[PDB]
Amino acid sequence: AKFVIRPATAADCSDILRLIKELAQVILTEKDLLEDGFGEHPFYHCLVAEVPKEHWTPEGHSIVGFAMYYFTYDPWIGKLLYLEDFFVMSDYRGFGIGSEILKNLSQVAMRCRCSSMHFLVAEWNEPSINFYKRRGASDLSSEEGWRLFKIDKEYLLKMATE
Amino acid sequence: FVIRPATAADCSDILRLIKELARYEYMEEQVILTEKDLLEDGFPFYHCLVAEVPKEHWTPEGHSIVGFAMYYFTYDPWIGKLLYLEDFFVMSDYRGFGIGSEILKNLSQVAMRCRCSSMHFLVAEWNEPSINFYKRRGASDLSSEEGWRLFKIDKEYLLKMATE
């Protein structure tokens, strides 16, 4: 199908949520997406793929893919573009949407002068691993010995009132 | 001591601590942050906290900053805004006063106000002192629990995709 890649706008929040859930507990609401993505200080940025009516989803939707990203920083690497999620609806793959999205993400990285694009991949997802390796990716966690940790809300609360 | 947001006047000390920490992680040679960059991106692509001591506590050569944390906000499509701790370090001579503990408490307060549901960060495989420090506070290993591996595609490869 004919498609165009463009930045998401506040009007696209319901579609972004639809796509997140399709990519998928998702407890994020449309209201969160609007408040967090379109205020003076946005916490994420999104590129979406839009198709014309002859190709709308059965449900009658025009957005069929997205890439959610944001900028991060590492004192010993550089400014970085962090790719949080990337998803194209099954029936809309094979027409170049993903390749155009990755192309535009890369151009954005060049504009921001980012030294690298970072993202996570599950250790057992060989297909995804090889898709990214074919594009020059390296498993930083394994090569340099880095593990990802988290501290959840119940713990943060205890320390914040302590 | 006191934990407080950093200011341009702190840029010098922050760079110094960044390099101390870098050496501890085996990569001081990779540091490309400059006091000028920290000024142009810190006041922003990141936020810094610094532990400042009074003068009777100033370091032997006169530094008043003995520790810092660098953080920024990220996003998870399932739960929303997250707080990401990029770097955390306390000078050796000042590691018994409970400064690291206070920095984490400050960061937790930042998370609570900004409605972050989780704080993420990386830890070196062999960094037992850091792993235990975080685990005693409730941290869990996500690479273990969910299989995540951090991948990177450097500039030279982004250029190839951008110009294809």
UniProtKB/Swiss-Prot annotation, chain B:
Enzyme which catalyzes the acetylation of polyamines. Substrate specificity: norspermidine = spermidine >> spermine > N(1)-acetylspermine. This highly regulated enzyme allows a fine attenuation of the intracellular concentration of polyamines. Also involved in the regulation of polyamine transport out of cells. Also acts on 1,3-diaminopropane and 1,5-diaminopentane. Keywords: Acyltransferase, Cytoplasm, Transferase. PANTHER family: DIAMINE ACETYLTRANSFERASE 1, DIAMINE N-ACETYLTRANSFERASE. This is Diamine acetyltransferase 1. Its EC number is 2.3.1.57. Coiled coil: none annotated. It is found in: Cytoplasm, Cytosol. Its main location: cytoplasm. It is linked to Overexpression of SAT1 and the consequent putrescine accumulation might play a role in the pathogenesis of keratosis follicularis spinulosa decalvans. Pathway: Amine and polyamine degradation; putrescine degradation; N-acetylputrescine from putrescine: step 1/1. One of its GO terms (biological process) is spermidine acetylation. Homodimer. GO terms for cellular component: cytosol. CDD domains: NAT_SF. PROSITE patterns: GNAT. InterPro entries: Acyl_CoA_acyltransferase (IPR016181), Diverse_Substrate_AcTransf (IPR051016), GNAT_dom (IPR000182).
